[PDB]
């Protein structure tokens, strides 16, 4: 926690000369307003004005005027005078928070969750990213930074070792890193965080993306969170380990049952499974995202839960006690953390307050099953394209309730425009398959 | 020996900021989990969790959850804040060691050996490696770092001397180096270690491979332990000098016989010769390995033992006293040290407890002998391909007992898949010989 006096003291002792008022849009892009430190007081008075329509992304029409209200607890100084940042909420000219701000939407969802008796919603993300080599002109190529495998000690200590530098710099900034390892695909890396509250977790995800992209550029590399940059290799996921708490106590832990899961946890996973098609578009917002949702690369392709399976939509880790959690594995690093977390929490709460019955967990004898038999058993498939994902999202009420009307409509319009632009392109695959056979 | 307090003191005084929890899979690849030093306590409590299925290599199916238990005696700090490492055993969620971990398998084999009255199994390896030049893009080429010969003083003193730097860095790390020399083939090098106990010897082999690969990259070179990188020149071997000890005393030494070999040593070498075809696949796990097992390059090609021969499978060095040992020369540096050592020890113990009679040693009049006469005498040939090596391994019970059912089955599946992928390739040799003659 910080106050105005703490911020002034930090600016004075650390010789901060630049301030970044940081926020996000509906597409998850990290936006910021740059300010000289001489404006610090005006920053602390919630008097900084900006367009505000930039939150709409590429579907903005008219310039508005909106105020930035910094959150003093998000204060941090970058290790590169010095530059400091503050994460700010967006307010309208009438003093009320802007309904199109994902952070405010997540805060509203958490506040409405608190009326159900729960106090905290903790998230631990597992973001995976790719590192590509840069060419002479400074553009990213398709060559990977290394050639390691799953949990390999591929980047040696002598040389670049971008992952180690990223971890150390995040530790210096005040982050809580659990562990890091090399991912399955060459040039793919994963850094894991300790669990934190929802808003703090999403802020940490945004800051982690920014820090990774900066440090990769320091090492003459390019960091990408693209869900599927390369065909034929593993994609990048952002698995969300979530846990509910109502007062110094995990609501998912059952200390008496051998399995160790309460009825609340079963209702939560049932609700997430019920509305999985509804929030797939939000959790997988890019056209490329659905190139990751293909079988054989551990990404989930159908709606099921298990404790031990190759690619379940929901996985329950063997940890118990205060660390019991539910892992949603459909999220990719390109998704907006606030919107995806709000959608997942809303689906879980919808399952909780409807007392839904969780279906049977899947086991090893599902690998031999076509889609027809899978549907006969009751296992629905995730949408395979962004078009069908938007079609499914337009038919779900829980996702609309989670997002709010403004964010829901803007996201649908943006994604429809993006798909419309994508669908008219003639791909090289078509020119290879056709143009000689026809 | 080290304790928790020693580790904390070392971290505090040396300013260790990064920890590598190091382990290995069934393919011998050095795997690791990276951790910030702030997690040190959680590391020392055996509470670090990871996939565990990575031990299976490329035949893993479902993600598991397994714990890492570090061995405090393996603590060492790399000379490149600082980075430290700890070699960890893999434990299941039920508190028992994972049966698929090669290190635990070797420990179990040693424990069962201790019931026969023997206390220690000392190993001294002779790993050989190649150094290739890197191109502008940083990829390895086929040009060697020097053009020296057997025991040559090729990289004299000034400019790279990669072997000297490797030896000095290993000495600074606390290793025990006996001697180093240039190998027969150009760009080929060998570094010899003093004998150590089995687990320590295999850990030293893994650390040596990691250190060599790091330092070669430091010198703009590429170090490879591939058994036969180049056709027409010598391959790289990892000859194992092994010795048995039952209490401050070498069990292979006979102080009265002028040969100086105990009947126990003869039984051990008889057992190793008997099951040589059984463990050839484990000691030579790559397809390329059997390109080294060709006549004319000192690699063993048939099953025989001698005290003076060009390429015997087992060699008995002239040293006696406490340093008498048996050298198995079929092992290559690409083999997993734990699995190969366990297989060799199990074969030796099988010979010991069956009181097998060692065949007559071979001498100079075997060079003029075809395979028919060699088989008539009683000299069997080693498997010539990985396919036939797997066929022979499937017919040996000693190798299965040495490896354990889990490791045996996973290794067989992995190698069968690898051979199946290799056999469908059309080689450049086939395109050179055919396509014009047919």
């Amino acid at each position: 926690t910080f106050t105005k006096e703490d911020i002034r003291k930090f600016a004075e002792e650390e010789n901060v000369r630049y301030l970044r008022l940081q926020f996000t849009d509906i597409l998850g892009t990290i936006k910021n307003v740059e300010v000289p430190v001489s404006q610090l007081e005006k920053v602390l008075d919630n008097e900084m004005m900006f367009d505000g329509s930039s939150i709409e992304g590429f579907v903005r029409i008219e310039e508005s005027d909106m105020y930035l209200h910094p959150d003093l607890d998000t204060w941090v100084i970058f290790p590169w005078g010095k530059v400091a940042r503050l994460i700010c909420d967006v307010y309208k000219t009438d003093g009320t928070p802007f309904e199109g701000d994902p952070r405010a939407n997540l805060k509203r969802v958490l506040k409405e969750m608190e009326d159900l008796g729960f106090t905290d919603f903790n998230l631990g993300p597992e973001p995976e990213f790719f590192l590509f080599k840069l060419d002479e002109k400074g553009e990213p190529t398709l060559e990977l930074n290394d050639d390691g495998g799953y949990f390999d000690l591929a980047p040696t200590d002598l040389g670049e070792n971008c992952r180690r530098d990223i971890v150390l710099e995040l530790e210096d900034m005040g982050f809580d890193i659990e562990a890091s390892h090399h991912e399955v695909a060459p040039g793919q890396h994963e850094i894991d965080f300790k669990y934190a509250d929802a808003v703090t977790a999403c802020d940490n995800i945004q800051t982690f993306k920014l820090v990774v992209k900066t440090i990769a550029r320091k090492h003459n590399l390019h960091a990408t969170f693209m869900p599927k940059p390369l065909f034929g290799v593993n994609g990048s996921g952002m698995h969300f380990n979530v846990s509910l708490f109502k007062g110094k106590e995990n609501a998912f832990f059952d200390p008496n049952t051998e399995m160790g899961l309460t009825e609340t946890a079963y209702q939560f996973t049932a609700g997430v499974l019920k509305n999985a098609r509804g929030f797939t578009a939000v959790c997988n917002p890019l056209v490329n995202s659905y190139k990751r949702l293909v079988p054989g690369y551990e990404a989930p392709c159908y709606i099921a839960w298990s404790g031990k399976n190759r690619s379940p939509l929901i996985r329950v880790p063997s940890s118990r006690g205060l660390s019991t959690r539910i892992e949603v594995r459909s999220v990719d690093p390109a998704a907006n953390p606030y919107m995806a977390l709000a959608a997942i929490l809303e689906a879980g709460l919808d399952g909780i307050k409807n007392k839904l019955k969780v279906p049977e967990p899947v086991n090893q004898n599902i690998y031999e099953m076509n889609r027809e038999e899978r549907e006969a058993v009751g296992i629905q498939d995730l949408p395979s394209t962004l078009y069908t994902a938007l079609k499914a999202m337009r038919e779900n009420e829980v996702i609309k309730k989670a997002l709010g009307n403004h964010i829901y409509n803007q996201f649908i319009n943006s994604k429809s425009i993006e798909w419309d632009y994508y669908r008219t392109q003639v791909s090289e695959w078509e020119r290879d398959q056709y143009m000689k056979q026809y | 020996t080290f304790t928790k307090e020693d580790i904390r003191k070392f971290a505090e005084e040396e300013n260790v900021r990064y920890l590598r929890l190091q382990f290995t899979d069934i393919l011998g690849t050095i795997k690791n989990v990276e951790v910030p030093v702030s997690q040190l306590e959680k590391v020392l409590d055996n509470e670090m969790m990871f996939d565990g299925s990575s031990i299976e290599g490329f035949v893993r199916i479902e993600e598991s959850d397994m714990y890492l238990h570090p061995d405090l005696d393996t603590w060492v700090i790399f000379p490149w804040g600082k980075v430290a490492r700890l070699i960890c055993d893999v434990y299941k969620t039920d508190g028992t060691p994972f049966e698929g971990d090669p290190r635990a398998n070797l420990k179990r084999v040693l424990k069962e050996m201790e019931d026969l009255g023997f206390t220690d199994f000392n190993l001294g390896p002779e790993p050989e490696f190649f150094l290739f030049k890197l191109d502008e893009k940083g990829e390895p080429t086929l040009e060697l770092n020097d053009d020296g010969g057997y025991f040559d003083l090729a990289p004299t003193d000034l400019g790279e001397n990669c072997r000297r730097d490797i030896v000095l860095e290993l000495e600074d790390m606390g290793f025990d180096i006996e001697a180093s020399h240039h190998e027969v083939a150009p760009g080929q090098h060998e570094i010899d270690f003093k004998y150590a106990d089995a687990v320590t010897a295999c850990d030293n082999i893994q650390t040596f491979k990691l250190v060599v690969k790091t330092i070669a990259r430091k010198h703009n070179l590429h170090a490879t332990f591939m058994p036969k990188p180049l056709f027409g020149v010598n391959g790289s071997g990892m000859h194992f000098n092994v010795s048995l000890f039952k209490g401050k005393e070498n069990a292979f030494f006979d102080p009265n016989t002028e040969m100086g070999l105990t009947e126990t040593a003869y039984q051990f070498t008889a057992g190793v010769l008997k099951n040589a075809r059984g463990f050839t696949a484990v000691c030579n796990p790559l397809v390329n390995s059997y390109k080294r097992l060709v006549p004319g390059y000192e690699a063993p090609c048939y099953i025989a033992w001698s005290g003076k021969n060009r390429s015997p499978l087992i060699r008995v060095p002239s040293s006696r006293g406490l340093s008498t040992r048996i050298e198995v020369r079929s092992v290559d540096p690409a083999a997993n040290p734990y699995m190969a050592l366990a297989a060799i020890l199990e074969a030796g113990l099988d010979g010991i407890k069956n009181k097998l009679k060692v065949p007559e040693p071979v001498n100079q009049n075997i060079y003029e002998m075809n395979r028919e006469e060699r088989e008539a005498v009683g000299i069997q040939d080693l498997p010539s391909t990985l396919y036939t090596a797997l066929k022979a391994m499937r017919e040996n019970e000693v190798i299965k007992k040495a490896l354990g059912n889990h490791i045996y089955n996973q290794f067989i599946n992995s190698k069968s898949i690898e051979w199946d992928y290799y056999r469908t390739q059309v080689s450049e040799w086939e395109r050179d010989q055919y396509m014009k003659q047919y």
Partner: peptide, 11 residues
């Protein structure tokens, strides 16, 4: 193959 992602080295 079920584990296509783990066999990417061979393909």
């Amino acid at each position: 193959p079920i584990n296509r992602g783990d066999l990417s080295r061979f393909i």
